């Protein structure tokens, strides 16, 4: 079934995720307050994204094999995947009850209008919501969720990757763990075409990444909006 190395990888990723994702969202109180009356939600959501990039980095450093990469490739992988992993990890707070990201209180409950109040349009937000729904619908085990984030981060085809054979090798070990996990631990019918549907989510994330990058570039070009960002967001996403 699952090898000991495969069981090891899952236990580490589970722990890595628990150490970087607080399901009580207690730190949200440190963010600039949400304003729902412009781009009124930009300070709050920029802080949320900035915080989330830090946590995504803390998760990534714990992925078995990620440490063996050069710092340059570590950098390229995190820079290109950061928004995608934020999209993936946000599925935990996302609720199909009202199509929103519910982080524990009405202040920290984010809907379509809040995201648009951060400078984004339906060109991003509609496919984003549709992503979140299709992802929710997979009913992933936490083990599959954390494997999916890790696979997303160690993607050998990201532009600027130097040692791609190594990135592919690290990813393959994660991919094989996920396939084996689905076969051994995920009961049918839930498991039906589950790996192929998870991989399709990774494809959906490329389009979302591209559209986010387009809108972010337009947003951040205005010095008055880029003023509202954080230094980390500027470094990771641009300008």
């Amino acid at each position: 079934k699952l090898s000991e190395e495969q069981q090891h990888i899952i236990a580490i990723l589970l722990d890595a995720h628990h150490k970087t994702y607080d399901p009580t969202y207690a730190d949200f109180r440190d963010f600039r307050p949400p304003v729902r009356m412009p781009l009124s939600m930009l300070p709050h959501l920029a802080d949320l994204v900035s915080y989330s990039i830090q946590k995504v980095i803390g998760f990534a450093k714990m992925i078995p094999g990620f440490r063996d990469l050069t710092s340059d490739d570590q950098i390229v992988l995190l820079k290109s995947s950061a928004i995608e992993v934020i999209m993936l990890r946000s599925n935990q707070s996302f609720t199909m009850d009202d199509m929103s990201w519910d982080c524990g209180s009405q202040d920290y409950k984010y809907d379509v209008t809040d995201v648009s109040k951060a400078g984004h349009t339906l060109e991003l937000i509609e496919p984003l919501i549709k992503f979140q729904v299709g992802l929710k619908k997979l009913n992933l085990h936490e083990e599959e969720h954390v494997l999916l984030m890790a696979i997303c981060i160690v993607s050998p085809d990201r532009p600027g990757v130097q040692d791609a054979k190594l990135v592919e090798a690290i990813q393959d070990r994660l991919s094989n763990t996920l396939q084996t996990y689905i076969r051994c631990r995920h009961p049918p019918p839930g498991s039906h075409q589950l790996y192929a549907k998870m991989i399709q989510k990774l494809a959906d994330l490329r389009s979302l990444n591209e559209e986010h990058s387009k809108q972010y570039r337009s947003l951040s070009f205005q010095p008055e909006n880029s003023m509202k960002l954080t230094p980390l967001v500027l470094e990771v996403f641009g300008n």
Binding site: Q54, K61, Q74, I75, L78, K79, P231, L232
Partner: peptide, 11 residues
């Protein structure tokens, strides 16, 4: 490039 913050967080 230049990513001192990302670099710092990466250890």
């Amino acid at each position: 490039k230049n990513h001192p913050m990302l670099m710092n967080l990466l250890k």
